[PDB]
Structure formats: structure tokens, C-alpha cells
């Protein structure tokens, strides 16, 4: 699909807020003309599906101000210092929920904002869990819950798992639990 | 008791396409924090199902990630119109199709950490093939895809666009008679 590609002619960081950094590019498109492209520069991230011995998954409730609501999510966070995302996933599982896992499996990489961010999220399945203690940052507010996967799938259908990364996790888990994808 | 209360708001950035809101909020610890996110108008995406059982999809280059994606057609809400209007227009502009049977599936939030974007996903059936009407700067190829092939592509990591991957999973549930 080389005939669809756009070639970068110029780049600049047009804005840096408290948290968000925006790149503004000029690109040459397949018509040979020049167009502006704008996107957030994001470090990447990891999310995991932590599957307990009893078959439930460990999830969280977290308020997200950008949408003004509380979401049911799988634990996740941003990639720090360009680390391997497996390290990101281990740290975030520990900090957000207090769990460690003996068995980690990479599932897939998703891109949640292809129109305006370079963000990718690596999704992992975590098994053989043991509990320790949740360790939250100042400014981080998280309630931990156990969810039955059948109940999760019904919530997806009902529109109650609108967070894309978590919904995608639910569908990958469903495939895994049914023995279709493993 | 997780809800954060807005103390102030301002639009700190407006570029060619992106707008950033910055709020001061009071959190459950009673302390003040900054929250920063993209102001997005919302969007629709749709899954156009053909009588031969294939779905209409697109290939589109996405500069933010520097690759070509397989996507279901989509676009941004214009002038706070109903997202079904958005879906009808974008299906016609991006793919050249019209549909007489539309069904809302679900609403997703692709960027809960830093955008208020929502995308409403629809299933479209009973299709007529007219022609694309692309905007300047828009480059899209239309392809026809077998759902079984799509699901294998998802497994292989070749449908990394969250909205399209989600559409694939919903379609799989619909086709399997489960939902
Ligand atoms: O899952 C996302 C959460 O973790 C990430 O590290 C980010 O800092 C922010 O978006 C939120 O705190
Ligand atoms: O699907 C997304 C596409 O459509 C939307 O209307 C936006 O303008 C932009 O992200 C892209 O051109």
C-alpha cells in the first residue's frame, strides 16, 4: 500500500502543556501536494488481563475526567524511560492492584488514536497471581474489583465497558477462555 | 467518591485540528490537580455488510502512527448532528455506499486518559454502491473483506486500530448468533 503513504517534509513540536505534547507536521501526500498533520506524542503503554485462580479477573474502577465518568478498566499505565512494556505491565499490576504474576504472555498491540496520537498499548495476559499491596501515587484514585468473565462480556454488550483497551481485553480473554485463541 | 470536581476550565491550545482543554479539579483526597485532554466532536464508525457476507472496509494511511491501516469507515460529527447522519455521510464519501438498514451497536471511548472522544458504532445493511467523494487531503482505498479473514488478521496483530478491531469482535458475535 505504498501508493497511500504520506512523506514527512517538516516537523515541529507545536505545543507542550502540563501533560500533552503536540507535533505538527507538513507531509507530501500521494497527490504530490502538502498537508498539515497534527498528533500527540505519547510514550506508549501496557495493559494486562490478570486472571485469578478462581477464574475471575482483577479489574479497577477509575474516574476519568476527560469523559467525566468512572470506567471499569483492566490495569494499565504508560511506558517509562523507554522500558520494555513487560516491565511496565508488571509494575502497574503491582501498584494499581497489589498483584504479581508468574506467567506473562504478550497478546497484541493496539493503537487507540490513529487519527491524532502515536500511542500504542501492548496487551498482556497475566496468570498465576499472588497478592501483596496496592501502592498508589498522589493524585491516583483506584478501586480494585474481581469480575467474572461471563459478567464482563454481558457488560460489554450492554455498553458498560466503553474503554477500548479494556473492551478489547475482554474479547481477547473470551477467545482465550473458549480455547479459540491460545 | 472517585468523582473529581471541576474548579476551572480553559482552552489552552487550538491548532489546525486539535483543541486542548485544561481543567483544575478537586480530587477525592481534597487536593487540586490539573487535567488536560483533547476536545473532540465525537464520531461514528460503521460495519457495512454485503449480501455475499463480506464487509466493506478501507485502507488508509495514518500519519500519527506512520502506517497504513485496515479500518471500517468512519468520521467526525459535524455541527453536533446525530451520529447516524455522520455515519450515512461518511459511508457514502469514504466508500461510495448507501444503506437502507442501520442499527446502533455500541459507543466506545478510545482515549479515556486524554480525550473526550466517543465513537458510535453502527451496522449497515441493504447496500447500494455509488461512488466515493473524498475531501482534499483524504486518500482511501475500498476493499471487501471476509469476516473469517478479518478475525485471523485481528489475531495476527494486523487490525491494531481499536475501533475496527472492536467492530470485528462485535461482528463475530453477531455472525455467530450470540449477540
Ligand atoms: O492508564 C492510564 C493511567 O496511567 C497512565 O500512566 C497515565 O499516567 C494516565 O493516562 C492514567 O494515570
Ligand atoms: O476517521 C478519522 C478521519 O475522519 C475524521 O473525520 C477526522 O477528520 C480524521 O481523524 C480523519 O480524517
How far apart CA B134 and CA B54 sit, in angstroms, is 23
Q: How far apart are the first and last CA of chain A?
A: 30
How far apart CA A111 and CA B6 sit, in angstroms, is 29
Backbone angles phi, psi at A88, to 5 degrees: -55, -50
Cell representation of residue B123? 451496522
How far apart CA A97 and CA A50 sit, in angstroms, is 10
Cell representation of residue B54? 463480506
Question: A119, A71, A173: which is closest to B161 by C-alpha?
Answer: A119
Angle at B95 between CA B94 and CA B96, to 5 degrees: 110
Total domains present in chain A: 1
- Number of other residues whose CB lies within 10 A of the CB of residue A78: 15
Contact with chain A for residue B38, Cβ under 8 A: yes
> Is the Cβ–Cβ distance between B35 and B50 less than 8 Å?
no
How far apart CA A84 and CA A101 sit, in angstroms, is 17
Question: A119, A109, A107: which is closest to B62 by C-alpha?
Answer: A119
CA distances from A42 to A11, A113, A124, A157 (A): 16, 10, 19, 30
Contact with chain B for residue A144, Cβ under 8 A: no
How far apart CA B40 and CA B142 sit, in angstroms, is 26
Cell representation of residue A173? 480473554
Distance of CA A148 to the CA centre of its chain: 21
> Is the Cβ–Cβ distance between B102 and B61 less than 8 Å?
no
Q: How far is the CA of B20 from the centre of ligand 1 (A)?
A: 17
Angle at A87 between CA A182 and CA A163, to 5 degrees: 65
How far apart CA B179 and CA B172 sit, in angstroms, is 9
How far apart CA B2 and CA A63 sit, in angstroms, is 6
Per the DSSP assignment, residues forming a β-bridge with B35 are B23
Range of the domain at A11: 1-182
Tell me the chain A residues in contact with residue B61 when contact means C-beta distances shorter than 8 Å. 1, 4-6
Cell representation of residue B138? 483524504
SS3 state at B71: strand
- Residue ranges of the alpha helices (H) in B46-176? 83-95, 147-155, 162-175
Resolution in Å, one decimal, please. 1.8
CB pairs under 8 A between A and B: 185
Task: Note which residues in 76-105 of chain B have CB less than 8 A from chain A.
Answer: none
CATH number for the domain harbouring residue A112? 3.90.79.10
- Residue ranges of the alpha helices (H) in chain B? 83-95, 147-155, 162-175
What's the 3-state SS for A37-48? EEEECCCCEEEE
CA distances from A68 to A14, A113, B25, B94, B165 (A): 27, 19, 11, 32, 25
Distance of CA B27 to the CA centre of its chain: 30
Amino acid at each position: 500500500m505504498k501508493h497511500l503513504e504520506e512523506k514527512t517534509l517538516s516537523t515541529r513540536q507545536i505545543f507542550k502543556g502540563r501533560y500533552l505534547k503536540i507535533e505538527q507536521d507538513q507531509v507530501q501526500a500521494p497527490d504530490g501536494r502538502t498537508y498539515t498533520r497534527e498528533y500527540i506524542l505519547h510514550p506508549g503503554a501496557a495493559m494486562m488481563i490478570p486472571l485469578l485462580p478462581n477464574g475471575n479477573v482483577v479489574m479497577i474502577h477509575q474516574y476519568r475526567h476527560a469523559v467525566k465518568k468512572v470506567f471499569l478498566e483492566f490495569p494499565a499505565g504508560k511506558r517509562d524511560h523507554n522500558e520494555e512494556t513487560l516491565l511496565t505491565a508488571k509494575r502497574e499490576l503491582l501498584e494499581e492492584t497489589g498483584y504479581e504474576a508468574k506467567d506473562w504472555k504478550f497478546l497484541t498491540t493496539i493503537h487507540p488514536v490513529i487519527g491524532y496520537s502515536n500511542e500504542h498499548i501492548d496487551l498482556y495476559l497475566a496468570r498465576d497471581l499472588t497478592h501483596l499491596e496496592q501502592r498508589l501515587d498522589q493524585g491516583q484514585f483506584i478501586e480494585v474489583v474481581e469480575v467474572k468473565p461471563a459478567d464482563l462480556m454481558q457488560l460489554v454488550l450492554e455498553g458498560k465497558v466503553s474503554d477500548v483497551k479494556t473492551q478489547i481485553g475482554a474479547f481477547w480473554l473470551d477467545k482465550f477462555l473458549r480455547g479459540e485463541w491460545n
